[PDB]
């Protein structure tokens, strides 16, 4: 099932550059990338969690992976 809409994607695009409609194929590609991202991130996080000898997914886990494999600091 869809986790991101064409609309919400387009708002994101607009936010970066108000006058710039993105090519549909590029929209699909990006939607696909968001899917791979959620997949890999959550998957890698669950590993970190399981390592904590835990079973509940927590921000801590996702954040740790983002910082380490993506150097994303949020």
């Amino acid at each position: 099932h869809m986790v991101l809409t064409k609309k919400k994607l387009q708002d994101l695009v607009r936010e970066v550059d108000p006058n710039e409609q993105l090519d549909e194929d590029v929209e699909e590609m990006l939607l696909q990338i968001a899917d791979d991202f959620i997949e890999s991130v959550v998957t890698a996080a669950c590993q970190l969690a399981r390592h904590r000898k835990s079973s509940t997914l927590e921000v801590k886990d996702v954040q740790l992976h983002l910082e380490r494999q993506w150097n994303m600091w949020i």
Binding site: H1, M2, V3, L4, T5, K8, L9, L12, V13, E15, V16, D17, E20, L22, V26, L30, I33, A34, F37, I38, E39, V41, V42, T43, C46, Q47, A49, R50, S55, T56, L57, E58, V59, V62, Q63, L66, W70, M72, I74
Partner: protein
């Protein structure tokens, strides 16, 4: 929320089952949504550059 809350929640919960995870803290969904928005935001910025 940038991403669709309900299906996101379900999909995260779904990926966890395959990886020893039984539960997930509530705001984890929002966090993932935020991270995904950043992932896409950077690519778009780069693409427009």
């Amino acid at each position: 929320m940038f991403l669709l809350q309900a299906p996101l929640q379900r999909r995260i919960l779904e990926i966890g089952k395959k990886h020893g995870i039984t539960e997930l803290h509530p705001d984890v969904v929002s966090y993932v949504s935020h991270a995904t928005q950043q992932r896409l935001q950077n690519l778009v910025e780069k693409i427009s550059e």
